[PDB]
Design a protein around this ligand. Sequence first.
Ligand SMILES: Nc1ncnc2c1ncn2[C@@H]1O[C@H](CSCC[C@H](N)C(=O)O)[C@@H](O)[C@H]1O
Ligand SMILES: COc1ccnc(C)c1C
Length: 254
Amino acid sequence: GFTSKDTYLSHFNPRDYLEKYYKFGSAESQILKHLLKNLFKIFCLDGVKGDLLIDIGSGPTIYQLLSACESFKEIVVTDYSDQNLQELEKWLKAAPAAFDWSPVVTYVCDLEGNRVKGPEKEEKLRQAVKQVLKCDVTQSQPLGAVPLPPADCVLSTLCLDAACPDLPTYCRALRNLGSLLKPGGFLVIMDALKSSYYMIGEQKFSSLPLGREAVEAAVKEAGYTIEWFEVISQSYSSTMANNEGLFSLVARKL
Ligand SMILES: Nc1ncnc2c1ncn2[C@@H]1O[C@H](CSCC[C@H](N)C(=O)O)[C@@H](O)[C@H]1O
Ligand SMILES: COc1ccnc(C)c1C
């Protein structure tokens, strides 16, 4: 009764996803602002830094990397959908058909103290991303045959509830992400709470409807220790998703 993974290869329209959720002209923009403030706190204020960050289930978005590129020498972006990776690559290569992230980039520049302007921030992110890879969080080796050094941080925004059909798969996906992380490395997860679907126009996608207690229990079961955990009450618009807020957490792998 859950969206098959192959649906993401064919029916997840990357440009329509960006238009619906990330235009930043709403509930969607309020959630985006909150995610950006937390990402800034984690990568710029807290000590989350290193040589390598792997972003899991990036989709076609780059908002979740704008503060991270200040703290990591390399960022690897990954997703199950090759269409999503191609949309990412249009932005990375600064193609005229790429999505316009400038209002979001400006917002992050403002949060960070106006030390830099938009073009410098975007160039820093483009220089940080060297690999754009296929991933499947449900597999013991999420990156398949591709080898990577153990990462200093694994980040995943709005991916795991969409990717995992049940709670045992969710806990296994957290272990599988841990196989990419060095001992003591950081796990940063942000996702919807209690959502059983989300929409991209008329296309429905399933989501696993977890509450905060089940998320925390799955992270401890998967072998991490949690440093902080935040719940926000703001939910998406009713035409988009049936969540009851969102969570953000930072944990370390044992
Ligand atoms: N098994 C799986 N492994 C990895 N990614 C998966 C997956 N199943 C779905 N996904 C990806 O999960 C993403 C959900 S949308 C989230 C996109 C982006 N990180 C954001 O913050 O908006 C999609 O890009 C989809 O392709
Ligand atoms: C589970 O809900 C989601 C999953 C992925 N992306 C978005 C934008 C939503 C609302």
